[PDB]
Design a protein around this motif. Sequence first.
Motif, PDB file in Angstrom:
ATOM      1  N   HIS A 114      -7.650 -13.959 -12.413  1.00  0.00           N
ATOM      2  CA  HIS A 114      -7.279 -13.040 -11.344  1.00  0.00           C
ATOM      3  C   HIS A 114      -7.956 -11.687 -11.515  1.00  0.00           C
ATOM      4  O   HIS A 114      -8.464 -11.117 -10.544  1.00  0.00           O
ATOM      5  CB  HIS A 114      -5.761 -12.881 -11.295  1.00  0.00           C
ATOM      6  CG  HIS A 114      -5.283 -12.007 -10.178  1.00  0.00           C
ATOM      7  ND1 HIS A 114      -5.576 -12.262  -8.856  1.00  0.00           N
ATOM      8  CD2 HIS A 114      -4.537 -10.878 -10.185  1.00  0.00           C
ATOM      9  CE1 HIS A 114      -5.028 -11.331  -8.098  1.00  0.00           C
ATOM     10  NE2 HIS A 114      -4.396 -10.477  -8.879  1.00  0.00           N
ATOM     11  N   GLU A 150      -4.658  -5.165  -2.538  1.00  0.00           N
ATOM     12  CA  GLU A 150      -4.167  -6.505  -2.242  1.00  0.00           C
ATOM     13  C   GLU A 150      -3.106  -6.502  -1.152  1.00  0.00           C
ATOM     14  O   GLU A 150      -3.005  -7.469  -0.392  1.00  0.00           O
ATOM     15  CB  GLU A 150      -3.636  -7.149  -3.519  1.00  0.00           C
ATOM     16  CG  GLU A 150      -4.711  -7.370  -4.570  1.00  0.00           C
ATOM     17  CD  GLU A 150      -4.161  -7.901  -5.867  1.00  0.00           C
ATOM     18  OE1 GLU A 150      -3.377  -7.195  -6.524  1.00  0.00           O
ATOM     19  OE2 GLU A 150      -4.503  -9.042  -6.228  1.00  0.00           O
ATOM     20  N   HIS A 176       2.792  -7.524 -12.963  1.00  0.00           N
ATOM     21  CA  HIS A 176       1.893  -7.391 -11.820  1.00  0.00           C
ATOM     22  C   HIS A 176       2.295  -8.320 -10.683  1.00  0.00           C
ATOM     23  O   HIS A 176       2.363  -7.901  -9.517  1.00  0.00           O
ATOM     24  CB  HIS A 176       0.454  -7.664 -12.255  1.00  0.00           C
ATOM     25  CG  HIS A 176      -0.536  -7.618 -11.134  1.00  0.00           C
ATOM     26  ND1 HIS A 176      -0.671  -6.528 -10.304  1.00  0.00           N
ATOM     27  CD2 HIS A 176      -1.437  -8.531 -10.703  1.00  0.00           C
ATOM     28  CE1 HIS A 176      -1.612  -6.770  -9.411  1.00  0.00           C
ATOM     29  NE2 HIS A 176      -2.092  -7.979  -9.632  1.00  0.00           N
TER      30      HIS A 176
END
Lengths: 54, 54, 54, 54, 54, 53, 51, 48, 43, 43, 42, 44, 42, 42, 38, 306, 281
Positions: free
Chosen positions: P219, P234, Q190
């Motif tokens: 990622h 994002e 995250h």
Amino acid sequence: MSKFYKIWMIFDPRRVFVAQGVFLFLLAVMIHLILLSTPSYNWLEISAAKYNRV
Amino acid sequence: MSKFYKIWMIFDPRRVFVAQGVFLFLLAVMIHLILLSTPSYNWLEISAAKYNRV
Amino acid sequence: MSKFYKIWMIFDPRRVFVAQGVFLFLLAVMIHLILLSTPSYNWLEISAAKYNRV
Amino acid sequence: MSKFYKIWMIFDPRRVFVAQGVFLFLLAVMIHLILLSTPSYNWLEISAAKYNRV
Amino acid sequence: MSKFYKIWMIFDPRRVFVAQGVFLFLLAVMIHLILLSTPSYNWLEISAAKYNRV
Amino acid sequence: SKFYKIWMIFDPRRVFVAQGVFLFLLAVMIHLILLSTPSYNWLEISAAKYNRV
Amino acid sequence: FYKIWMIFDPRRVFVAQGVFLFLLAVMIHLILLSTPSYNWLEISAAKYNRV
Amino acid sequence: VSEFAFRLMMAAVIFVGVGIMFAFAGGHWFVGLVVGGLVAAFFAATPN
Amino acid sequence: LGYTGLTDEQAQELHSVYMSGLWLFSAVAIVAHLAVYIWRPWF
Amino acid sequence: LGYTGLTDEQAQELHSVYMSGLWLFSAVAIVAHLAVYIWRPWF
Amino acid sequence: GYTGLTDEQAQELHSVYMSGLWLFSAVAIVAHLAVYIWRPWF
Amino acid sequence: DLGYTGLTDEQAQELHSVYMSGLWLFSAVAIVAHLAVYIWRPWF
Amino acid sequence: GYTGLTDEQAQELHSVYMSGLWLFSAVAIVAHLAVYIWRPWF
Amino acid sequence: GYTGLTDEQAQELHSVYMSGLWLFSAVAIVAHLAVYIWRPWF
Amino acid sequence: LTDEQAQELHSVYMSGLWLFSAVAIVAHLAVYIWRPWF
Amino acid sequence: AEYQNIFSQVQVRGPADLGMTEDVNLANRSGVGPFSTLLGWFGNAQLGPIYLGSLGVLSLFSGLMWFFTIGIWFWYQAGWNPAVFLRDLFFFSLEPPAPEYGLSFAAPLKEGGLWLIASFFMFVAVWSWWGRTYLRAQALGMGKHTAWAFLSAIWLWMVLGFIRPILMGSWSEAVPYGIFSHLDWTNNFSLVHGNLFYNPFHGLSIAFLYGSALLFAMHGATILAVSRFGGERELEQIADRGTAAERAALFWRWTMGFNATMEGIHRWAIWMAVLVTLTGGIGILLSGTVVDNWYVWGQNHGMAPL
Amino acid sequence: ALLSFEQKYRVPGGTLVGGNLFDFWVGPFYVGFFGVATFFFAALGIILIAWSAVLQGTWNPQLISVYPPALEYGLGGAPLAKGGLWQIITICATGAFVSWALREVEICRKLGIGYHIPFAFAFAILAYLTLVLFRPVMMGAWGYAFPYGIWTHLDWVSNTGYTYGNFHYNPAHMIAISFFFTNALALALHGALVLSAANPEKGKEMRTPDHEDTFFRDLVGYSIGTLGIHRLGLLLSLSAVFFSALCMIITGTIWFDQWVDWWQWWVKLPWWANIPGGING
Ligand code: BCL
Ligand SMILES: CC[C@H]1c2cc3[nH]c4c(c3C)C(=O)[C@H](C(=O)OC)c4c3nc(cc4[nH]c(cc(n2)[C@@H]1C)c(C(C)=O)c4C)[C@@H](C)[C@@H]3CCC(=O)OC/C=C(\C)CCC[C@H](C)CCC[C@H](C)CCCC(C)C
Ligand SMILES: CC[C@H]1c2cc3[nH]c4c(c3C)C(=O)[C@H](C(=O)OC)c4c3nc(cc4[nH]c(cc(n2)[C@@H]1C)c(C(C)=O)c4C)[C@@H](C)[C@@H]3CCC(=O)OC/C=C(\C)CCC[C@H](C)CCC[C@H](C)CCCC(C)C
Ligand SMILES: CC(C)=CCC/C(C)=C/C=C/C(C)=C/C=C/C(C)=C/C=C/C=C(C)/C=C/C=C(\C)CC/C=C(\C)CCC=C(C)C
Ligand SMILES: CC(C)=CCC/C(C)=C/C=C/C(C)=C/C=C/C(C)=C/C=C\C=C(C)\C=C\C=C(/C)CC/C=C(\C)CCC=C(C)C
Ligand SMILES: CCCCCCCCCCCCO[C@@H]1O[C@H](CO)[C@@H](O[C@H]2O[C@H](CO)[C@@H](O)[C@H](O)[C@H]2O)[C@H](O)[C@H]1O
Ligand SMILES: CCCCCCCCCCCC[N+](C)(C)[O-]
Ligand SMILES: [Fe+3]
């Protein structure tokens, strides 16, 4: 001495009360645990030996 | 010495009191625990041996 | 000689005072702990031996 | 005092009630767990010994 | 010799003073620890042997 | 002469800081090496001379 | 050999030369100190019966 | 080669040399490692 | 020196009350140390 | 001074109630300590 | 200077800091004298 | 102001009354439980 | 040319720094004399 | 110059740095002579 | 870098190198007199 | 060479961001700290402001007392000698009570009581911090994904320190407070229960830790690879898909035959990470209580030769 | 097949080797020179693992193990039944991994994105080659590598670790474990933060990166940022794998003893070597 009330001038009452409660609770639990750790002041063990229990 | 008061014109009273309280409590707990770990100054063990408890 | 009062013109009193307090406390604690760990200057053990407390 | 009722004018009732519920639940569980962990106050073992069940 | 003050025109006083204070403290600690390590200059053990404290 | 042109290529602040670090490290090294050899360990020489140990 | 100063940056050349020359000197001195034959402190100690 | 990269190689060389010299001076590899590491870290943190 | 927006007289008042608290704490500590020393001297 | 925005009367009333709470807590603690000392003195 | 303090402000601040330093040092001197009389280290 | 939470004096007093009723109920039950346990098996 | 200090300011700052350095050196010299009288290292 | 310094500034910097170097060398030579009479290494 | 600047820098660097070598030869000769290596 | 977008080339500084208000009590939010250039080379330079509330005060005091108890025990173990303290810092340990005390609270201070005190402090600190992670998200109107992901680690922590010792009937089963001593505890735990490699849930936990490293390398590399199209934003790519999200999806579709979305990749992330401690807690809870020898268990279950 | 936005991205070019010879797709997959190479290597490796299972005598997937050559063979070839099949399968695995990385490079070039993913995969390939190629070659025998079995490579891990006592005391092992743990923690944080911003309390609007920054500033007093978190993840994973490869490359080559004894250098430092008290006094 006869002028203390002015803590409430500079310190928010909510913060002071929360911190004081946290401190008092933690200190009381610590003292009780220390007493349970000492064989001469573990009241449960003292009463077990006094009344001939397990 | 009669002029220390202006330290309050440099330092925030709230920060000073919070840090001072934390420091004093930790120092007191450290001293009490050091005394407990000292065989001749553990008042709980001193009283246990004095009164023939444990 | 008597012109040290300009030191506060260059250095912030807040940082200087906080750093000095931290340094002085840490140095004092280290010296006290060195003395305590020294068997010949451990005042608690010296008193215990003097008064036959163990 | 006869004026404790203003503690509710300072603190949010929801937060106070939730804090009390959590504190009382954990205190009760802690005390019951200590009692169970104490062989002289484990009521199941006391009844097993008293009624000769094992 | 009579022109060293111009160092201050090239070096900031704050950084110079902080660096010199740290260096002085570290050098003093190193020399004190070196003297403490040598048995012939360890003043605590020297006094302990002189006065028969152990 | 004409060595002053060295203050045309390097920053004097960096030059002085580097030279001070250099000199302090060199002095510490030489003093420690002298302390390493018993011949020039003045603390040990003093201990032997005065019968302190 | 004057083109170096228009090919290689003078700052980097001087810094690298100084670093490497000082390291070479200290390594040579420490190699001499390692060997007892040329260890001048040990030589003086033997000569004057210091040890 | 960039200025930061040159500073990095110089820091590595200084680290090695100072580590050797202070391991000899202090009588232990750790003293040399500490001195060389601090010196190289200070050198690499201050480029042009 | 005005670092915290606090007047000179307010500093005097706050210092007076802070030192009142400090002397109460110190008097209690002195009495406690005296009691401990009488009970078990450490010198 | 003032940071939390309380008047003199408000601070006095809050201090009075806090002091009442502190005195009740301390009175209960003193009674408990006296009971424990009678049960098992630690001196 | 950097702090922006006036000259008289520096005078007063250093006077108070020095008074505190002298009080601390006097207490330290008394403590060291008491320890040395009790148990000298030389 | 009169408070931080936004409760009238009367709202706070009523809420405190109900709270103390609940507290006294809990404490009475706890007192009875402690008395029963002490009679069954005292710890002093 | 980087700090912006004037000639008089730099001279004053260096004079105070020198006063401090001499005071420190005098204290260190007295301490060294005391130690040497106690236990000389030569 | 790359450093941006003028000719006069470089000359003065070198002059004062050389004076400091000479002072350092004088002190070092005095110390080395003292050590040499105390204990020669040659 | 200018050709004149490069020439002047080479001149001063060579002068410094010559002084360095003049010191180094005297040191090496003194060490050889004190203790020849072969 | 080529800029790989790992360290910033240029740092820009403006006024410090004080954060969103939402439903946050702004009186409990401190001031902004200093700006760190060293941190700004990699991420954000700004430090603070922090929120300090009731649960924050409780958590800080509890954790401070936990650290203080452990540290003062270490100082006692060193004989109050600072040099010995530095020499043996990784060798000091606050150990649980001995097994003969069971779950009782009668162990002495040097033989288990102080460990119990420190464990109570840690319990209060960690649960206060969990409540804090919940309430800080609630104040901003956010979902409580952080709180329930923290609960997964709290599950393993509780099993290691609280639940499994209670189910095993002694506090001695718990982990000591020390650097090398908790490593010794880990090794001895594996040795006592056969081979923890042959615990299927230890294997699942290892698979999910390896997969966390896998997935988050993938990622990070993917987002840095499409950061030239603003792929690190994002949330805006979820709201308004751009060519960064499309290229990131198509790389993985062409590589391994399937891809994710700019949202669902973080669902993969949260689940892969939480499953580590989720399976670890179950694996530890089954050791000693259900299986005492994991190698023999694996032999009986087709995992090892008979 | 195709995603709704796929068609405009499927263009010729971006191939290191082969030109248009293999420039096509099979379903969603992109095939190239290295795609064809990957398929061949993976198929040969898997088929040879099945044949090794036939030779071994078990069909249980959890009991199948392909063992490296014995220590007696050194670095030479071994009979296929003993360790030759392992060597061929290791060559096939290396070919498959490197061809996978190069196919990823080709796909990156075609899509016009960075090469961060093949570079990060090269770290895992290097750790694998450390375990099967570099460390065995340094040690002098193919038998120091691990077998290809689901539970027997765990046996290899256990045996190799316990050759040096408790392996926890390897310092690079400690650093790598710290990196792995921190990476899992950061991945959880995250994922949770992005999901909590994108999925607020029901009925509320989407949250912004400002809310994410605010939430971790409220929690811990610092927020690394949207770019910082992805950089941090890449570096945490790559550092963990790098330090794993390092701790294994130093083990058995420059360190041959119990790793617990290594730490005695700090304890035996001259100034506190002999002070009584503590644990080591
Ligand atoms: C000989 C050694 C043993 C072994 C015995 C153990 C034992 C025992 C356990 C593991 C467990 C694990 N092992 Mg194992 N393990 C072995 C060999 C391995 C190998 C290998 C290649 O050899 C691998 C990679 C692993 C990897 C792992 C992980 C998958 C797993 C740890 C999960 C975790 O992140 O916990 C770290 C996270 C936590 C512990 C939770 C933390 C949450 C709390 C709330 C943190 C609070 C912080 C606190 C307040 C401090 C605050 C400080 C300030 C904030 C600064 N094992 C062998 C055979 N292993 C664990 C597991 O669960 O598996 C069943 C476990 O219990
Ligand atoms: C999904 C499983 C993974 C995971 C997840 C995870 N961990 C989490 C979270 C999540 C989702 C959080 O939300 C939470 C968090 O806050 O993250 C930033 C947390 C967290 N995980 C943490 C640690 C942690 N996680 C670990 C592991 C893992 N966490 C797993 C791999 C480990 C390991 C591997 O050992 C550790 C050590 C914390 C950073 C944090 C929870 C912090 C906490 O509860 O703190 C309580 C405080 C204490 C007990 C100690 C305080 C010590 C101080 C000295 C107190 C005093 C301070 C002082 C007063 C300051 C004064 C300053 C002034 C003088 C200036
Ligand atoms: C370096 C940081 C971490 C990392 C990163 C990483 N991994 C990656 C990537 C990246 C960046 C990819 O781009 C690439 C990918 O496409 O992932 C989906 C990949 C990948 N990492 C994978 C796995 C993987 N990564 C692991 C670890 C890690 N990967 C690191 C922790 C592990 C561990 C720890 O065990 C595994 C199992 C794949 C999902 C994929 C690469 C797929 C591949 O190579 O495809 C071609 C090859 C085959 C189809 C299989 C060939 C089979 C052989 C011929 C025979 C079997 C040999 C094998 C050695 C037997 C093993 C036996 C026992 C040990 C079980
Ligand atoms: C604005 C205005 C007008 C007013 C503001 C009001 C103010 C400012 C109020 C403040 C008043 C007070 C309390 C001031 C207090 C000041 C104090 C305690 C100063 C104390 C100074 C002490 C000093 C240097 C001590 C230095 C000591 C040193 C190096 C020691 C070094 C020791 C070594 C190297 C250890 C050697 C030994 C071993 C290793 C075993
Ligand atoms: C210099 C000064 C002043 C200070 C220095 C301070 C220092 C050095 C500190 C060193 C700290 C160190 C090393 C800490 C290391 C810690 C480690 C590895 C911990 C590992 C695992 C811990 C775990 C699972 C703990 C789990 C505990 C849980 C679930 C809960 C327990 C709850 C209990 C048992 C409550 C019991 C009590 C009641 C019911 C009243
Ligand atoms: C940057 C990496 C760390 C720094 C570099 C370290 C490289 C290895 C050291 C190279 C220099 C030699 O360093 C030297 O090694 C010997 C090995 O017993 C040790 O020296 C020790 O034994 C030697 C004799 O062998 C004695 O003369 C010396 O008094 C004693 O301290 C010390 O380590 C150091 O004096
Ligand atoms: C804005 C200040 C908020 C907290 C004020 C509380 C009064 C001072 C508390 C000092 C003691 C702190 N502690 C943690 C030891 O209780
Ligand atoms: Fe992301």
